[PDB]
Design a protein around this ligand. Structure first.
Ligand SMILES: Nc1nc2c(ncn2[C@@H]2O[C@H](COP(=O)(O)OP(=O)(O)O)[C@@H](O)[C@H]2O)c(=O)[nH]1
Ligand SMILES: Nc1nc2c(ncn2[C@@H]2O[C@H](COP(=O)(O)OP(=O)(O)O)[C@@H](O)[C@H]2O)c(=O)[nH]1
Ligand SMILES: [Cl-]
Ligand SMILES: [Cl-]
Ligand SMILES: [Mg+2]
Ligand SMILES: [Mg+2]
Ligand code: NA
Lengths: 161, 167
């Protein structure tokens, strides 16, 4: 069965662990140790194809990063600094993958929050700069959560051929 | 405000890991199964600074200067099973019944905890526990001592049940 190796990267506190646990256990985790980096597997159905998602939830202190096929690059919309940090993440990815075409999705998490400091336009301009999709999500409400992971899986499928 | 909390449950469910996690904010891999002790922590709950005193049970077959006077002063109980341990779950009724008797009451502030929710080998599903917890009319919270998931939720919910019971 087709196993996808997905990595979630981003500044700490943007919701990398909440996003993953949401997809895995379908619950919003209020508290999750920021230091715990781990892999989680889930069988999903994406476009009528069943597959196994292997997700590395990074805590950012390399079997996975060498075999990884797709990246979620996560900022929080209430956290300008995390957004500023995105370029750092993009650059590390292009290196660990020695390529300029790595399947990648820009994720703006915490979209249930009213205190936005990063607008959709800013992030679409970044995502267009990279030529990747932008998806707005909330780990707490499930907004765009499947869309983010499934859009990455769809990017991988294009890249495989 | 001091809250006197007791953690009860079968051997191996993570009573000591849960407590140490709340107290010292780290996951203890090994803790002597036989050590029953009280741990104090100043926390802020709902804007209220409060001293949480926690009696971590080990089913002491010896003397415990605390449980002797703890069970007489105790205000709130965590009833802990592990989700990968059907037997520990089956044991919950035993614990609930023993509590009502040591406290000679039908209204003891109490929370049902399903620990080691980080494990994929679950033998007790959310519904079974919510049905047990509803039978007792208490909250169910799923936790992992290892990831901190729901740990503050469990303890803070118990403190909130106590506050309701006090008035
Ligand atoms: N309101 C809200 N809080 C979120 C969201 N995602 C994560 N959080 C919270 O933000 C905090 C940090 O998230 P966490 O997943 O631990 O961050 P990480 O370092 O990227 O793994 C926690 O208190 C989460 O519950 C979200 O979409 N909405
Ligand atoms: N995976 C997992 N293991 C846990 C968790 N809590 C405790 N453990 C382990 O389970 C065992 C029993 O935990 P302990 O706190 O000593 O249990 P007690 O006998 O109820 O006091 C130890 O190996 C702990 O490391 C948890 O949340 N997740
Ligand atoms: Cl690097
Ligand atoms: Cl496209
Ligand atoms: Mg995390
Ligand atoms: Mg113990
Ligand atoms: Na077991």
């Amino acid at each position: 069965m087709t196993e996808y190796k997905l990595v979630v990267v981003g500044a700490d506190g943007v919701g990398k662990s909440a996003l993953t646990i949401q997809l895995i256990q379908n619950h919003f985790v209020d508290e999750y140790d920021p230091t715990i980096e781990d892999s989680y597997r889930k069988q999903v159905v994406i476009d009528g194809e069943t597959c196994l998602l292997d997700i590395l939830d990074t805590a950012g202190q390399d079997q996975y990063m060498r075999t990884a096929e797709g990246f979620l690059c996560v900022f929080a919309i209430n956290n300008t600094k995390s957004f500023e940090d995105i370029h750092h993440y993009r650059e590390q990815i292009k290196r660990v993958k020695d390529s300029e075409d790595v399947p990648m999705v820009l994720v703006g998490n915490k979209c249930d929050l009213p205190s936005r400091t990063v607008d959709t336009k800013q992030a679409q301009d970044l995502a267009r700069s990279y030529g990747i999709p932008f998806i707005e999500t909330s780990a707490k409400t499930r907004q765009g959560v499947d869309d983010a992971f499934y859009t990455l899986v769809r990017e991988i499928r294009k890249h495989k051929e």
